[PDB]
Each structure stands twice: as structure tokens, then as C-alpha cells.
């Protein structure tokens, strides 16, 4: 019940036809071109594969998700952020952020081809990054693909205590304050779960997707700017 993607066509098979185990395995092949990738997110699909393997496309059931408002924040994190040593920006250094993610340990799945593919979406205005700075040094951040009022988180990275939590916390506030509705996490992991991510039915997620992709945030919401300083 899988499928080999057409090298000339950008079409995808329906997500409900994906495998149960591995969860969401939907197709393989094709390419990571701007249009293809973009099409995959509109349909609740995303590429995920290790170096050496051919492109693998997924749409898991259930789906990992994070309600911005339901973001969990311990009391020591609140004390920390009130006196934060960090500065947070948006779309200041997409290239550095994704490279920071691809440099962790699964950062090994963020292959050169993947870095190049998402960089294209960034240049084209679809992928965005949140940077966390400690003085002059980039110490964390995250990036994803905007889909209207729905944001699909791709990865995060941390080089200093609470750096990635500061990226998400600040991002959520900004996002919530301007109409953001949901953050897609694809698959629930340990870190993502401690932040408040939960699981909902694949069709529920696809319903939200179709509804939120039409939604709109302020026209200049993603222009590069400082989001948190003093």
C-alpha cells in the first residue's frame, strides 16, 4: 500500500493509505524540489530518511502536535526567562540554525540535500527560523515550515542551557499573539513531550491542516526582526 513517486509529477497518494508500522510510511523517491515539498506539507506529508537511503515520505497516525497555549513551562524556567541572558530573533540566520540542527547527534538525517532543500523554501519564504543568541554567539534555535496559521516544526538544537526552550517559548508567544493556531511536531519524542506536545488522530490533524492553511497571519509576520531583547 506504498507507492513510488513520479519523477515528473508532483502528486502524492492519500495519507490514509500509509503503513501502520513503520507508522505513516507512505511513499519513496521523487525529489526534494520546492514544489514537491510544498505539496507534501499541504497534504500532511513530510520527508524523513537517513543518509544513503532513498527519499521516504511520511504521514503518521496518530500525529504529534503542540497547542501553543498549552506549552508547559516549569517555574525555574520562568525564573530563568525573567532574567534571561538570551536574545531571540526571527529569520536572522536560517542557514546557521538548520546547520546547528544537522550537527547534533537525529541531526544525522538532516543530509546536505535536506539542508539545501529547506534553504530553498526559506529563500522562497516558506521555511523560517527562530534564533537564540547569547551575546554574539548563536546558542540555539529552531526552524520549520509555515502553513498559514499552522506551523510545522522541523527541528531544534541547543548549545546552552534552556536555549531551545527559550526559542519555542518566545516563538509561541509571538505566534499566539498574531493568530497562530497549532504547531505540528510529526512524531512525539521525549523532549517534545515534556514541552507539552500531545497526540491526535491523523484525520483530525488533516482537518486542522486544511482549515489552518487557509488562515492568515500578518503580512509581515515573518520578516526578519528581533523578538526578545532587554
Amino acid at each position: 500500500r506504498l507507492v513510488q513517486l513520479s519523477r515528473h509529477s508532483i502528486a502524492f497518494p492519500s495519507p490514509e493509505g500509509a503503513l501502520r508500522e513503520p507508522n505513516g510510511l507512505l511513499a519513496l523517491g521523487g525529489d526534494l524540489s520546492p514544489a514537491r515539498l510544498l505539496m507534501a506539507y499541504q497534504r500532511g506529508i513530510f520527508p524523513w530518511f537517513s543518509p544513503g537511503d532513498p527519499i521516504l515520505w511520511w504521514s503518521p497516525d496518530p500525529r504529534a502536535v503542540l497547542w501553543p497555549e498549552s506549552l508547559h513551562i516549569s517555574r525555574s524556567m520562568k525564573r530563568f526567562h525573567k532574567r534571561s541572558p538570551y536574545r531571540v530573533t526571527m529569520n536572522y540566520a536560517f542557514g546557521q540554525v538548520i546547520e546547528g540542527c544537522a550537527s547534533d547527534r537525529e541531526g544525522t538525517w538532516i543530509t546536505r540535500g535536506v539542508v539545501e532543500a529547506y534553504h530553498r523554501l526559506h529563500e522562497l519564504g516558506h521555511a523560517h527560523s527562530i534564533e537564540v543568541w547569547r551575546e554574539d554567539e548563536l546558542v540555539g534555535g529552531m526552524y520549520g515550515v509555515a502553513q498559514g496559521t499552522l506551523f510545522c516544526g522541523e527541528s531544534m538544537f541547543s548549545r546552552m542551557e534552556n536555549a531551545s526552550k527559550t526559542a519555542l517559548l518566545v516563538f509561541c508567544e509571538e505566534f499566539i499573539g498574531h493568530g497562530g493556531k497549532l504547531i505540528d511536531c510529526q512524531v512525539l519524542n521525549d523532549h517534545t513531550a515534556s514541552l507539552g506536545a500531545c497526540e491526535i488522530p491523523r484525520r483530525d490533524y488533516l482537518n486542522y491542516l486544511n482549515q489552518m492553511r487557509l488562515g492568515r497571519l500578518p503580512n509581515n509576520f515573518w520578516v526578519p526582526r528581533c523578538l526578545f531583547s532587554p
Partner: peptide
């Protein structure tokens, strides 16, 4: 964020 597990 899938690239965290």
C-alpha cells in the same frame, strides 16, 4: 519536531 528522536 521529528528530528529530535
Amino acid at each position: 519536531f521529528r528530528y529530535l528522536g
